[PDB]
Amino acid sequence: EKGIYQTSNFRVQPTESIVRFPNITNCPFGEVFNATRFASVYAWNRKR
Amino acid sequence: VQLVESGGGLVQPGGSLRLSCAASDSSFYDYEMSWVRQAPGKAQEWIGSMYPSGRTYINPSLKSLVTISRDNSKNTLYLQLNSLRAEDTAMYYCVSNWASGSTGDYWGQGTLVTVS
Ligand SMILES: *[C@@H]1O[C@H](CO)[C@@H](O)[C@H](O)[C@H]1NC(C)=O
Ligand SMILES: *[C@@H]1O[C@H](CO)[C@@H](O)[C@H](O)[C@H]1NC(C)=O
The secondary structure element, H or E, covering residue A31 is helix A30-33
Asked if residue B10 lies in contact with residue B91, where contact means CB atoms within 8 angstroms, the answer is no
Compute the distance between CA of residue B44 and CA of residue A47 in angstroms, rounded to an integer: 31
Question: Ligand 2, from A33, A37, A47: best to mutate by most atoms within 8 Å of Cβ?
Answer: A33
**Alpha-carbon span B26 to B102, nearest angstrom:** 21
DSSP sequence for B49-116? ---TTS-----GGG-SSEEEEE-SSS--EEEEE-S--GGG-EE-B--TTGGG-SSSS------EE---
Q: How close B35 comes to chain A (CA, Å)?
A: 18
CA distance B17 to B66: 11
User: CA B97 to CA B101: how far, in whole Å?
Assistant: 8
Residue having the nearest C-alpha atom to atom 4 of ligand 2: A34
Helix (H, G, I), strand (E, B) or coil at A33: helix
Q: What angle do CA A36, A39, A43 make, to 5 degrees?
A: 155
CA of B5 to the centre of ligand 2 (A): 27
Give the residue among B51, B54, B4 at the shortest CA–CA distance from B32. B51
Write the residues followed by a gap in chain A (C–N more than 2.5 A).
26
* CA atoms of B72 and B111, how far apart (whole Å): 22
Give ∠ CA A46-B95-B6 in degrees, rounded to 5: 40
B15 within 8 A of B65, measured Cβ to Cβ:
no
Q: Do A40 and B109 touch (CB under 8 A)?
A: no
Interface touch A43/B9, C-beta < 8 Å: no
For CA atoms B5, B111, B78, B87, the dihedral sign is positive
Q: Residue A7's CB: how many other CB atoms inside 10 A?
A: 4
Query: How distant, in Å, are the alpha carbons of A12, A13, A28, B20, B82 from that of B66?
Result: 81, 78, 37, 13, 7
By what technique were these coordinates determined?
cryo-EM
Q: Is B62 left (phi over 0), alpha (psi -120 to 50) or beta?
A: alpha
Give the phi and the psi of residue B7 in degrees, each rounded to 5.
Answer: 75, -170
Residue A39 makes CB contacts below 8 A (sequence gap 6+) with: A45, B9
Strand partners, B80: B18, B67
What span, in angstroms and rounded, lies between the C-alpha atoms of A47 and A9?
A: 60
